[PDB]
Write a protein that binds this DNA or RNA. Structure first.
Ligand SMILES: OC[C@H]1O[C@@](CO)(O[C@H]2O[C@H](CO)[C@@H](O)[C@H](O)[C@H]2O)[C@@H](O)[C@@H]1O
Ligand SMILES: [Mg+2]
Length: 580
DNA sequence: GCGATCAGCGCGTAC
DNA sequence: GTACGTGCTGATCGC
């Protein structure tokens, strides 16, 4: 049965009620400077469809959109807010975002459209977006009649689903998490994405020119050593050259053939000179394809800025994800890749990039939740945690800790945070399973509180069916009761890791909200550009650096109060690379 | 059967 | 452990 609604030719007063389900449809996946294909409003007076060209040109509608006292319920309001920002229109008063609500209730549903969220409450009087717009190469906006009914049905679902979703959130004690954390953060992310980050395109192009030369050279060297030409990027063609032709040892295999991962290649290097060249080729290729060419493809030619989109409703732990381009995985560990950061610069003259990062926030969070006396004392003394762990595991003084000892203790620490397992650590340190088990046993003898937490959290996950974070975010783990060892194993590791990774996410998210409030109170021009899980990147006039040096660390360190101190390091400079 | 497309995944970056 | 972009490739689409 068709849903009744008014296909409006002009905006009327009843469309401007102080409470409404609002749909501002942006079909393009990347909503930056994208078209708004239609608008739908559902309130106490009825259901309406408005053509964007009409509504967005109407002074009354635009004022209504920007009136904080006129409440709107939406699905993915950030998408609409940003699309509107590009049109110079402000969106205010969003009091409920169904996407964020669904995400908090259960990240595992993969809810990416109104229909998926509605299905959670037995509401199916709305079609999935893919059914209406199509998929891939056949994706397209349908004629007005079809488009109009779809947007109205989505607004109608939002209108009806608000109460049930808020009730369940309240039951889960997650209503504040939605209203005080995620929704306010959504607005901050919209500002960050809209602002974008300035790119020194000529610097990237220059790097691309040099890389192209080095690539060609290494490429020819590889063919000379292989005794023939082939597609070095082909797993089967490379696997044949290395393991069948050159007969190098097969140390590891994939599900479809031979493994050629970097760690495997490193072990084969001694056997043939072609190996080091392949590694070099891949190193150069990674930078060229993903960080040079890939980055240049998404830079806006008119402003030379990249505008990422922070997916706020995707990760199972509460973290954000970044796309087109992903600005959360720009190289930093190795100098060759780190240089890519010299290309990210301040958007204005006499401005600088300012970066602040939490020092070991996940291990500090673990110390707090596990209430492990030894670990808490270590952080209270602000000790080098990996050296400290080496001292405990190997039972030696600080001076007796060798570089290799610290390296292995470091790996144990990461394993503990990620959800420890003898098999896992054994692969990471290239040792036997029995040897890994010994490291783990030694670790738990030194950190009995951590051991207890790991045991208790897995049992809690089984009893309750989910695990939670400091701010009440939750993750269901049905596989915790799987009869398949491997499957259950993953679930147990997720039970151990989620509260840590997730609580770390809750903390930085609150820090972002607190920071923006302080920047505004202080009248600073400084503003957030990016968030990379445990760090925040801002840009501001050079005249604001000294104040930022005191303000940013304090806000981030005081976001929450834990049993151990929170520590934030910071640096600033002319480019992202220099903010080190 | 085959070119175009889609869908899975090895790989390598980040934290 | 949590992600994303990439290039290749087997599966599936569309003739
Ligand atoms: O607007 C981001 C928001 O939209 C979803 C779908 O509801 O993802 C879409 O947009 C992302 C950013 O462009 C794409 O990566 C994704 O492929 C596309 O479906 C949500 O997952 C996200 O929170
Ligand atoms: Mg750090």
């Amino acid at each position: 049965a068709k849903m009744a609604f008014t296909l409006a030719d002009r905006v009327t007063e009843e469309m401007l009620a102080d409470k409404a389900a609002l749909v501002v449809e942006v079909v393009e996946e990347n909503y930056h400077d994208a078209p708004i294909v239609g608008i739908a409003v559902v309130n106490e007076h009825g259901r309406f469809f408005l053509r964007p060209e009409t509504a967005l040109a109407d002074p009354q509608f635009v004022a209504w959109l920007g009136d904080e006292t006129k409440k709107k319920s939406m699905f993915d309001s950030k998408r609409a807010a940003v699309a509107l920002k590009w049109k110079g229109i402000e969106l205010c008063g969003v009091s409920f975002d169904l996407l964020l609500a669904a995400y908090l209730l259960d990240p595992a549903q993969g809810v990416d459209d109104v229909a998926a969220a509605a299905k959670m409450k037995q509401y199916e009087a709305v079609r999935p977006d893919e059914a209406v717009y199509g998929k891939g190469a056949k994706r397209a906006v349908p004629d007005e009649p079809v488009l109009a009914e779809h947007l109205v049905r989505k607004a109608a679902a939002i209108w009806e689903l608000e109460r049930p979703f808020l009730d369940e959130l309240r039951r889960n004690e997650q209503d504040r998490l939605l209203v005080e954390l995620e929704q306010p953060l959504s607005s901050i992310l919209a500002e960050m994405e809209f602002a974008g980050v300035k790119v020194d395109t000529k610097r990237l192009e220059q790097m691309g020119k040099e890389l192209a030369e080095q690539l060609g050279t290494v490429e020819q060297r590889i063919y000379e050593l292989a005794g023939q030409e082939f597609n070095i990027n082909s797993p089967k063609q490379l696997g044949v050259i290395l393991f069948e032709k050159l007969q190098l040892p097969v140390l590891k295999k994939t599900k479809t053939g031979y493994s050629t991962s970097a760690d495997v290649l490193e072990k084969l290097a001694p056997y043939h000179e072609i190996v080091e060249n392949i590694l070099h080729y891949r190193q150069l290729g990674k930078l060229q394809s993903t960080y040079i060419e890939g980055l240049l493809k998404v830079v806006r030619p008119d402003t030379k800025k990249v505008h990422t989109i922070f997916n706020q409703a995707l990760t199972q732990t509460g973290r954000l994800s970044s796309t087109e381009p992903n600005l959360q995985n720009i190289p930093i560990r190795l100098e060759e890749g780190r240089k890519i950061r010299q290309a990210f610069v301040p958007s204005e003259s006499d401005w600088l990039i300012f970066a602040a990062d939490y020092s070991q926030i996940e291990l500090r969070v673990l110390a707090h939740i596990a209430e492990d006396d030894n670990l808490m004392e270590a952080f209270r003394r602000d000790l080098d945690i990996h050296t400290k762990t080496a001292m405990d595991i190997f039972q030696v003084s600080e001076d007796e800790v060798t570089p290799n000892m610290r390296r292995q203790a470091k790996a144990v620490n990461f394993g503990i945070v990620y959800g420890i397992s003898d098999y896992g650590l054994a692969q990471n340190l290239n040792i036997s399973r029995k040897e890994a088990a010994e490291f783990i046993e030694r670790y738990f003898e030194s950190f009995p509180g951590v051991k207890r937490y790991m045991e208790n959290i897995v049992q809690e996950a089984k009893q309750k069916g989910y695990v939670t974070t400091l701010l009440h975010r939750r993750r269901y783990l049905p596989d915790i009761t799987s009869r398949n060892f491997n499957v259950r194993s993953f679930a147990e590791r997720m039970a151990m890791n989620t509260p840590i990774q997730g609580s770390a996410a809750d903390i930085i998210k609150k820090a972002m909200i607190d920071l923006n409030a302080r920047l505004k109170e202080e009248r600073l021009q400084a503003h957030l550009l990016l968030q990379v899980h445990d760090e925040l990147i801002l840009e501001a006039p050079k005249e604001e650096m000294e104040r930022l040096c005191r303000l940013v660390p304090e806000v981030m360190e005081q976001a929450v109060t834990l049993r151990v101190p929170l520590k934030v390091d910071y640096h600033y400079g002319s480019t992202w690379y220099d903010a080190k």
